[PDB]
Amino acid sequence: SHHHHHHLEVLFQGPHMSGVKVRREDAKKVLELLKSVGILDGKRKAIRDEKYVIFPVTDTNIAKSLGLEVVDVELPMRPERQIYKNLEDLLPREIFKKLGRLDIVGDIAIVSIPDEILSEREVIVSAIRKLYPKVKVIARRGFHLYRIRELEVIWGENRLHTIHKENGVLIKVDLSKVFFNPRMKGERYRIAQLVNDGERILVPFAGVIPYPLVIARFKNVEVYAVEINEFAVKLAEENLELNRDRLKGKIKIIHGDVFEVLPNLPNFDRVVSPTPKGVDALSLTLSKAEKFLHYYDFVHESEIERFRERVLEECRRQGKECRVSVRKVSDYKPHVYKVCADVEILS
Numbered sequence: 001s002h003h004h005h006h007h008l009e010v011l012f013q014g015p016h017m018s019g020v021k022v023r024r025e026d027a028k029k030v031l032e033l034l035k036s037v038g039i040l041d042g043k044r045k046a047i048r049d050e051k052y053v054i055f056p057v058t059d060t061n062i063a064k065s066l067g068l069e070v071v072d073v074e075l076p077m078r079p080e081r082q083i084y085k086n087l088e089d090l091l092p093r094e095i096f097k098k099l100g101r102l103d104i105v106g107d108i109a110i111v112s113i114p115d116e117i118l119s120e121r122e123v124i125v126s127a128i129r130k131l132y133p134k135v136k137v138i139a140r141r142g143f144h145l146y147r148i149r150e151l152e153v154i155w156g157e158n159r160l161h162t163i164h165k166e167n168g169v170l171i172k173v174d175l176s177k178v179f180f181n182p183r184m185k186g187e188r189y190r191i192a193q194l195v196n197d198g199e200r201i202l203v204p205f206a207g208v209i210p211y212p213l214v215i216a217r218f219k220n221v222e223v224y225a226v227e228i229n230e231f232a233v234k235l236a237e238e239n240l241e242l243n244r245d246r247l248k249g250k251i252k253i254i255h256g257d258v259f260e261v262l263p264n265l266p267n268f269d270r271v272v273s274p275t276p277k278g279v280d281a282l283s284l285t286l287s288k289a290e291k292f293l294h295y296y297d298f299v300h301e302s303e304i305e306r307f308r309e310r311v312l313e314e315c316r317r318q319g320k321e322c323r324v325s326v327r328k329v330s331d332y333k334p335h336v337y338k339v340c341a342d343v344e345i346l347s
């Protein structure tokens with residue numbers, strides 16, 4: 001006897017050699033159609049020219065029954081090995097160049113996407129997933145009293161809490177409720193290395209206490225942390241307990257308003273002020289410092305001189321003899337820097 005045709009039809013051992021040719025204008029619609037129908041060939045790459053896109057397909061008879069122009073073409077094989085290093089390696093420059101910076105916090109990727117390229121959301125997500133296989137959440141960043149970033153989940157688990165690893169500590173965060181910038185890992189380590197055992201240190205605006213955690217992880221010191229957001233305070237308490245067996249130093253968490261709390265504290269060897277953008281806490285934080293102040297601010301590159309001058313002015317106003325050094329910590333916007341004034345109080 002013989003076989004049923006609908007059993008034989010799947011035996012062909014060779015590869016798929018055809019694709020459909022569509023106007024770029026119709027490319028998205030057609031990609032969706034081909035996926036829906038089930039004949040999109042994952043084994044090969046699509047290509048494009050000035051006016052046309054060619055998608056690889058698995059069944060040219062079904063393609064024709066979709067009204068599509070079938071062509072015979074040698075399309076590239078899908079890559080088996082990936083050597084992507086940057087997001088730019090995975091996107092058209094016209095898309096990539098419009099993206100804000102990409103941050104990884106725990107297993108969450110955060111990216112800024114202007115409305116203007118929101119139509120490219122799917123390839124953007126694809127690119128990020130490829131570059132970061134382990135991330136489970138991709139969120140779109142808006143803008144930052146508690147300085148929470150506006151965030152919308154655009155791929156993955158519908159959550160914004162995670163645990164981030166940095167400088168030998170564990171930091172629980174919930175990005176829907178608290179501020180956290182992973183890019184400050186350098187600064188936090190830097191200050192931790194400058195600190196000497198036996199210091200008493202004050203960190204106003206402490207968030208989920210990443211600065212105190214890193215400092216205390218490396219130095220036997222006492223750190224006071226002041227934070228007004230009760231969600232951040234809660235997470236800070238949990239972070240203290242989560243890291244307790246690896247800290248050399250001690251941390252005291254105070255829930256309160258810096259501008260109410262600090263006038264009622266004793267003074268400290270060192271003050272570290274990760275100031276909220278736009279807020280001026282220089283007088284108050286310097287007033288709590290006996291030997292060092294590390295005061296963060298955001299300054300236009302044409303105003304740096306004036307910034308240094310104002311810091312020295314406030315030093316004189318408080319009767320302190322100081323040397324002031326201003327460092328560019330990071331590029332914030334074009335022509336605008338996150339800076340740190342390192343103030344050494346002389347005796």
Ligand SMILES: Nc1ncnc2c1ncn2[C@@H]1O[C@H](CSCC[C@H](N)C(=O)O)[C@@H](O)[C@H]1O
Nearest residue numbers: 146179180205206207227228229257258274
């Ligand atoms: N008056 C005030 N008193 C105490 N904390 C304040 C405050 N105004 C703003 N904040 C807190 O200041 C923080 C600034 S963000 C810096 C967070 C943390 N130091 C870090 O390095 O990630 C936010 O957590 C915000 O809730």
